[PDB]
Amino acid sequence: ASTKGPSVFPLAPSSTSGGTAALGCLVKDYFPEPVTVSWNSGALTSGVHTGPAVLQSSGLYSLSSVVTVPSSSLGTQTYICNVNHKPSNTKVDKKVEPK
Amino acid sequence: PKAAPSVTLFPPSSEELQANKATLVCAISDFYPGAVTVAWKADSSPVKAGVETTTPSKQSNNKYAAWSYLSLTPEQWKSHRSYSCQVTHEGSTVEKTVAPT
């Protein structure tokens, strides 16, 4: 079957309100479902919003994951989203750095 | 019975723009009940082309969350002073705005 692995882009923190920053990853243009997303190899679970995917007019899916972290952690704590797309045997670990 | 949405709008990443693509991501959370309308503006003009909004899903905070995406060309993105994601929930609207770097 035809598959297409995702293009993963950072959603950089800049996105900060009352001492909390939101950052994330955009998992673009993959096929078929599903993708899974973890953060810091499963170390970061609290305040994570992931999925569901959107089906674009192209017939490809996109999905995002956003985590809210303390703003003081930025540039200290590394944030890596771990994206797995089993159907294409692709994994992407994207480092999300402040802009 | 209502809780207003929290909204974060992300501009296209530098990496995506370098790949000749652009996506705005509007992350919506913490709202109840679980229905929203999402409207996008390019400067002040309403746009529906390239928009996909998810159906809100219940989170572990017992409140609803959703996403809206706007796909556009890098040239479209750079041609405007700003884009806005406007989230209407029970008649009231939370709007976030971002601009090219």
UniProtKB/TrEMBL annotation, chain A:
It comes from the Eukaryota. Residues 6-97 form the Ig-like domain. It is found in: Cell membrane; Secreted. This is Uncharacterized protein DKFZp686G11190. It comes from Homo sapiens. The lineage of its organism: Eukaryota, Metazoa, Chordata, Craniata, Vertebrata. The gene is DKFZp686G11190. The chain holds residues 146 to 246 of 475 of the full protein.
UniProtKB/TrEMBL annotation, chain B:
Keywords: Disulfide bond, Immunoglobulin domain, Secreted. It is found in: Secreted. It comes from the Eukaryota. The keyword Amino-acid biosynthesis does not apply. GO terms for cellular component: extracellular region. Residues 5-99 form the Ig-like domain. Its main location: secreted. This is IGL@ protein. It comes from Homo sapiens. The gene is IGL@. The chain holds residues 36 to 136 of 139 of the full protein.
